[PDB]
Every structure is written in structure tokens, then in C-alpha cells.
Amino acid sequence: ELVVTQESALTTSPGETVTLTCRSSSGAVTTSNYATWVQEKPDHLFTGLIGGTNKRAPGVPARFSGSLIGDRAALTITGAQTEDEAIYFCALWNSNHLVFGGGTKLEIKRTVAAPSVFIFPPSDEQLKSGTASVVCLLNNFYPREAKVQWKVDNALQSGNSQESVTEQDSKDSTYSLSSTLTLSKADYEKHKVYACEVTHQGLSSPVTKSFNRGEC
Amino acid sequence: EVKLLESGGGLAQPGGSLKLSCAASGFDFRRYWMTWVRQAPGKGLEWIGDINPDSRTINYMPSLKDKFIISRDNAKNSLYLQLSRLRSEDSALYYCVRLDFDVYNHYYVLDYWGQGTSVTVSSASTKGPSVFPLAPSSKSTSGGTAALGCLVKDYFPEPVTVSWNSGALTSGVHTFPAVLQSSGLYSLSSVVTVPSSSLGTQTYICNVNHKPSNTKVDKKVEPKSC
Ligand SMILES: Cc1cc2nc(N)n(CCCCC(=O)O)c2cc1C
After folding, report:
1. Are B140 and B35 members of one domain?
2. Which of A54, A98, B77, B127 could lock onto B47 through a cystine, CB 3.0 to 4.6 A?
């Protein structure tokens, strides 16, 4: 049962050199595994990078190189650029079938950028349906680590919110996140103050965006 | 100029079958090996199998060797994948991939990939999305930029596509990945920042589309009236 493994994530700074590895659970990776690499950019855009372990694919900048390091196959990016932010997949050929690794998320360090916070009260139309969705938006920040806490009339909520985060923006290398608090129309009407508290490295003190139900 | 376009995805019933197709162009299809790769939710890529030019050699991933059938029609520059005995585990994005095969140099690379076609193996019914407006919590006087958007909630199965002003507006747009709600329904938001001043003059419309339920909605987001 061959299992190809890769480091889940790595972070490097521009101009730096980084190496992603690919190991086999059945032993050392070898030339006969024909290790190959694929890059996944946002929107399910994949592109072949390396083939035959160390041979670059046409159109691939020379900053990319392949090789065997120890018992693993590796992809080395010299002079990392922000355009290199992506997920790199590795695959090994096991005699009669191809096995992909779990992929490595490569992040490119950039300066701290605090998020712009926005809170969206539920729409009237949505309320008619009996449900109320409160949305909180954290826009273009970095690093990704950000804590968003919901408070309904100073009562810290829990278990009733889901969040989504975008891929590191190719341009500014930032992330954007949204947290959605979902309540029954009933509960929503049982409270007044709805606030979103955001904590992030780029903020000296947590930022709170809020609104009082009914207040326009 | 290589182009790979998949089709055939959609909601299917467990135990059922489904035939996916891929249209190719930009290269001598007849001279290349073709490959199918899929990606299930929260998972990485998984090789399904490949087929050589003359269809005389067809390799499959150990497991699906039987419930999966690959074929091609060089005359029509097409690649097919016949799925069968569909189980929830087969729910994934199916990619059509061209394989540059060089046995002389032992160089094998999956160069060009299509963007895939989504396939959901569920017993649930198809449901359309409700599009709610995320009104600009700002005015013109405030000066600067305001955030607004659309909340596409309670639909099934994936995926939904969202654009603004029929594509005219793309800068500042952030369409988050859909989230699976406890209800088993999907939901997502799409926001975008515009200049406060344009609020009241410029019209902001988000165009939501959900093929599975043949839903098409254009919601106009305006500043909530106070
Ligand atoms: C991505 C990839 C796909 C492949 N499909 C086949 N069928 N082989 C086997 C290659 C031929 C075996 C040989 O002559 O050594 C593959 C190798 C790689 C790296």
C-alpha cells in the first residue's frame, strides 16, 4: 500500500530558496519512480513542473529544479517569488499505477497587514424564511492567523458560526476571511447588540464591528 | 494553445453510473496519452488511469480498475470516463489531463490539465440557492470604499458560480469557498469593494448560477434604506 507523503505546509521569504520533499512509505524514492511535480493555483489550475525526477517541463522557469535528496524526491525553488504561492503536488510511479502525495502549501512571507473588518446584518428577505445569517468580513490581511469571536449582547457565541478563507492573493499575498453566525429568526429577535470581535497580529488591540438589531 | 474541457459532471445516485467527457484542442490529440485524475473534498489528487493513443494500453488505479472505464475517440479529439457503482467516495472534481510520455528519457509529465467537472454521488435531491444581499454598510459622504456582496445560501450540490455585473466587475471581488452547513446544504458569500460615491449611481449586481437546479439569479445589492 504505497503512501506518498509531503510536508503539509512551508513558508519562505522572497528571494530565498526552499525545498519540498516527497517520500515513499515503501522505501527510498528512486529514478524508477519517475517522481513528477504539479502546481495547483487558485481555481483548480494545475500545471506540470518536473518529470523524470529532475527534468524540467517546457515553460517552467529555471528557479525550479528536481532531485533526489536522501530517500526522498524533492522540488527546489531558488529565489522564491510571490507568484510561487501555490500547492505543490508530487507523484510517484509504483510499477503499474501513479500515486500522488498530499501536496504542500507553499506560503510566501510578506509584511503584516491588518484586516479590514465589516459586519453585515441579515437581510429582511432572509428573515422571512425564518432564519437569520450575520456575516463578518475580514479583508486582505496577513498572516493568515486571525481569531474572530461573535458576541450577541456581550455573550460570546460558540458552535453557531462557520468561516471561509480565500487562497493567498497572487497580487498582495493576503488572505480574506468571512465568518457567518447563523441564528433562528426567533433568537435573532431576542437580542440587540451584534458584534464581531477580530484579533490579528496587525492589530494592537482587537477590532470590533457591530450593529444594533433594527437600527439603521 | 492546449485546451481540455470536461463535461458530464453533476448530481448522481449511489449505485448508479455516469459518463464524463473531455474535449481537447491545441495539440495533435492522436499523439498523446490522456489521463483522468480526481480530487475529493478535503483530499489531494488521485490518479484514476490513463490511455495511450491507439487505446491498446489502458492503465487504472488498482481499486477502480473495474468500476472505471477509460476510452477515447481520436477522430473527435475526445476522452471518456465511464463511472459505475457510484458511492459517496466517488464525489469529486474529475480532471482531464494530457500526459507527455517520453519513454526514451523516462520523462512522464502531466502537463496540461482541464479545470475539471464536479460530480456528487448523493441520494439527496437537487436544490437551488437563495440569494441574499449583503448591503453596503456605508454611504457616499463617508468617503472611501464600501464593502458589499451576496450571500448564496442553502443549495445542493456544488457548485455555484458568481460574477458581478455580468463580468464587468472583477476587481476587489472575493468569492469564498462554499461551506457545508449542518443541514447538508451548501452556502457561500461573495463580496466586493467599490467607491462609496458610486453608491446610488453605479449599480451592483451579482450573477449567481447553479446548473444542477438550473437556477440563475441576478440580485441587485443596494444600500439598505434608513
Ligand atoms: C505521471 C506519470 C504517469 C504515468 N503513466 C504511466 N503509464 N507511467 C509509466 C511509464 C512507463 C514505464 C517505463 O517504460 O519505465 C507513468 C509515469 C508517470 C511519472
Report:
1. no
2. A98
How many whole angstroms from A68 Cα to the centroid of ligand 1?
18
**Kind of pairing, strands B186-195 and B173-175?**
antiparallel
- In the sheet with A155-156, reading across from the earlier edge strand, the strands are A155-156, A146-152, A193-200, A207-212
Residue type, B1: E
Rounded Cα distance, B112 and B82, in Å: 21
CATH homologous superfamily of A111-216 equals Immunoglobulins (2.60.40.10)
Expressed in angstroms and rounded, the spacing between residue A35 Cα and the centre of ligand 1 is 10
- Give the list of residues 6+ apart from residue B209 with CB closer than 8 angstroms, or none: B160, B161, B162, B215, B216, B217
A139/chain B closest Cα distance in angstroms:
9
User: What residues of B are in contact with residue A91 (Cβ under 8 Å)?
Assistant: 45, 47, 110
User: What is the torsional sign of CA B219, B174, B88, A180?
Assistant: negative
What is the rounded distance in angstroms from the CA atom of residue A157 to the CA atom of residue B88?
Answer: 33
Amino acid sitting at position A197: E
Test the A interface: residue of B98, B104, B132, B163 with most A CBs within 10 Å: B132
Residues B7, B20: contact at Cβ < 8 Å?
Answer: yes
Q: Which three cell numbers stand for residue B94?
A: 474529475
Same domain, B26 and B86: yes
The answer to whether the CB atoms of A122 and B132 lie below 8 A apart is yes
Q: Classify strands A55-56 and A104-108 as parallel, antiparallel or unpaired.
A: unpaired
Using the Cβ of A89 and the Cβ atoms of chain B, whether some distance falls under 8 Å is answered with yes
Would you state the cell numbers that stand for residue A89, as one nine-digit string? 503536488
Cβ density class B101-124: b for 16+ within 10 Å, e for less: beeeeebbbbbbbbebbbbbbbee
Task: Report the DSSP pairing between strands A207-212 and B179-180.
Answer: unpaired
B138 and B172 assigned to the same domain: yes
Q: How was this structure determined?
A: X-ray
Question: How are the residues of chain A apportioned to helix, strand and coil, as percentages rounded to the nearest 5?
Answer: 5, 50, 40
Domain count, chain B: 2
Does A100 sit in the ligand 1 pocket, CB within 6 Å? Answer: no
CATH 2.40.50.140 fits A1-110, yes or no: no
Range of the domain at B178: 124-226
Peptide bond into A143 cis (omega under 30): yes
